[PDB]
Amino acid sequence: YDIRGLQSFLDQASRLGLDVSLQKVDKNISHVFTSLFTTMKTEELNRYRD
Amino acid sequence: GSPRTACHLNPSPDGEAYTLASRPPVRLNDVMLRLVTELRWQKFVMFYDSE
After folding, report:
1. Glycans attached where (chain A)?
2. N or C: which end of chain B has fewer CB atoms below 10 A?
C-alpha cells in the first residue's frame, strides 16, 4: 500500500486532538507475532489488548 | 527548497542496475527515533508543507 492514500485523514484526525500510534504489518505474519511476543512484556501485552 | 521524501524501486528482475542516484536517503528517520525520546516526548504534532 502507498501510504499517501491516508495522509489526509491523519491531519483532521490529529485535529480531533486524539492520541494515536501508527504501525506497519510486514509481509509475513508469523514473523510479526514472533517479533511481538518475544518482546511483548506483560504491560506490553496489556496495552496491546487495549 | 522543500524537504525530501523517498522514491522507491518498482519490482524488476535481478542483475539489472545502471540507473544511478548520487543522493543520500532520508537518513533522519532513525534520528527522529532517537530524538523524540531524547527530547523525552510522549505526544506531539508534526507538519509538512503543500508539495
Report:
1. 28
2. N
Cell of B6: 523517498
* Cα–Cα distance for residue pair B20/B11, rounded to 1 Å: 16
Cell of B47: 507538519
Which helix (H) or strand (E) segment is A29 a member of?
A: helix A29-37
Would you give the end-to-end CA distance of chain A in angstroms? 26
Which single residue is written with the C-alpha cell 524488476? B12
> End-to-end distance of chain B based on CA atoms, in angstroms?
10
Experimental method: cryo-EM
Q: Interior CA angle at A19 toward A14 and A21, to 5°?
A: 95
Give the separation between CA B34 and CA B32, rounded to whole angstroms.
5
Query: Distances in Å between the alpha carbon of A45 and those of A21, A29, A42, B2, B50?
Result: 16, 17, 5, 41, 39
